[PDB]
Amino acid sequence: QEDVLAKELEDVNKWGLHVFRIAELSGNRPLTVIMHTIFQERDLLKTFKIPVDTLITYLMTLEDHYHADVAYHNNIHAADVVQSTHVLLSTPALEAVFTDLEILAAIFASAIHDVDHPGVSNQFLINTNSELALMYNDSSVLENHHLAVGFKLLQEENCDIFQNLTKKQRQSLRKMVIDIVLATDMSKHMNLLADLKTMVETKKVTSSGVLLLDNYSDRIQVLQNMVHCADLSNPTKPLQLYRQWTDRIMEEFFRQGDRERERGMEISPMCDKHNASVEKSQVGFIDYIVHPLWETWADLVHPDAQDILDTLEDNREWYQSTIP
Ligand SMILES: CCn1c(=O)c2c(c3ccc(C)nc31)O[C@@](C)(CCO)C[C@H]2C=C(C)C
Ligand SMILES: [Mg+2]
Ligand SMILES: [Zn+2]
Structure with a gap:
């Protein structure tokens, strides 16, 4: 069984790795095994002197703090975004652009x-006067919490995977991680996309064709939209992967809508299981969010992402075809 798992993990460089099999094959440890595999693939343990037992311990603690009982926003989604970001980092148009x-x-x-x-x-967290929303003053409540938890778990026993980074290295890494994770809040998406469009329109390259990034502002914005793209990459995956993501997000949305209905709150868009159009919501998701972003990212790394954009447009046509 680890033989099969090890074989599926050979695909870690490929878009459309089957992350759900890896979840099953790894005993519901997709995040740990995929992270471990990617760090070895990129030689990160050696570059940053990360003890392998420390890496495994942190990854398993971190994976534990995703909710196994949440249908979409769980460790499988985390593993998938890790792996999608890993592929996006390897695109030819970005070779030698970013530091270790x-x-x-x-x-x-x-x-x-x-x-x-x-x-x-x-x-929802704001409207129900949750502790989270009270702590974070209604601003990117979830995303600030993800960061706080992710950094906090580095302090548990044998969990500081950054123990051998220099002081300046940790400082820079910490600031970059915060900038990237706060950019996953959808409230930031329009301004993020506008900057990405502006960069594409004014795009600079080197003699060897690779994208030229002069300054922190441009470098971090590319990394922000990269992870944001990976976060919004479900409709760009092979359809049998996409559809399982759609099942999971809709079940999680419906369960929030149930709570909203129990409390007499207005039900959030797409959360009313008695008034939901799964297919229309996926088409609108693609038309108004995912395709505008991925089309701009494809322009940035042209033609590296042509196949991914083709898949997205095929999936859009497929969901459209299923509207009654
Ligand atoms: C049902 C369509 N749909 C979404 O509406 C949303 C998705 C999402 C992810 C995967 C699939 C398949 N569908 C999704 O992801 C979010 C929650 C992830 C990042 O915060 C973005 C949220 C989009 C909004 C609220 C405009
Ligand atoms: Mg999020
Ligand atoms: Zn996410």
């Missing part, structure tokens, strides 16, 4: 970006 520390930041940020998600939206 920046690569570490983006992969780490992807691993922690939804930890301890309770399965309800920011607006």
Whole structure:
């Protein structure tokens, strides 16, 4: 069985790795095994002197703090975003662009970006006067919490995977991870996309064709939209993967809508299981969010992402075709 798992983990560089099998094959440890595999693939343990037992211990603690009883925002989603970010980092148009520390930041940020998600939206947490919303003053409530939890777990026993980074290295990594995870809040998406469009329109490259990033502002914005793309990459995956993601997000949305209905609150969009159009919501999701973003990212790394954009447009047509 580890033989099969080890074979499925050979695909870790491929879009459309079957992350759900890896979840089953790994005993519901997709985040640990995929993270461990990717760190070995990128030689990160050696570059940053990460003891392997420390890495495993942190990853398993971190994975434990995703909710097994939340349908979408769980450790499988975390593993999938880690692995999608890992592929996006390897695109030819970005070769030698980012430092090891920046690569570490983006992969780490992807691993922690939804930890301890309770399965309800920011607006729900605000409207129900939750402790989370009270702590974080209604601003990117979930995303601030994911960060706090992700960094806090580094202090548990034998969990500081960054123990051998220099002081300046940790400082920079910490700031970069915060900037990246706060960018996963959808309230930031329009401004993020506008900057990405502006960068594409004014795009600069080097002699060897690779993207040229002069300054922190441009470098972090690319890493922010990269992880954001990976977060919104479900409709770009092979359809049998996409559809299982759609099942999971809709079940989590419906359960929030049930709570909203129990409390006499207005039901959030797409959360009313008695008035839901799964298919229409996926088409609108693609048309108004995912395709605008992925089309702009494809422009940035053209033509590296042509196949991923083709898949997204095929999946959009397929969900559209299923509207009665
Ligand atoms: C049902 C359609 N749908 C969404 O509406 C949303 C998705 C999402 C993810 C996967 C699939 C398949 N569908 C999704 O992800 C979010 C929650 C992840 C990042 O916060 C973005 C949320 C989008 C909003 C609220 C405009
Ligand atoms: Mg999130
Ligand atoms: Zn997410």
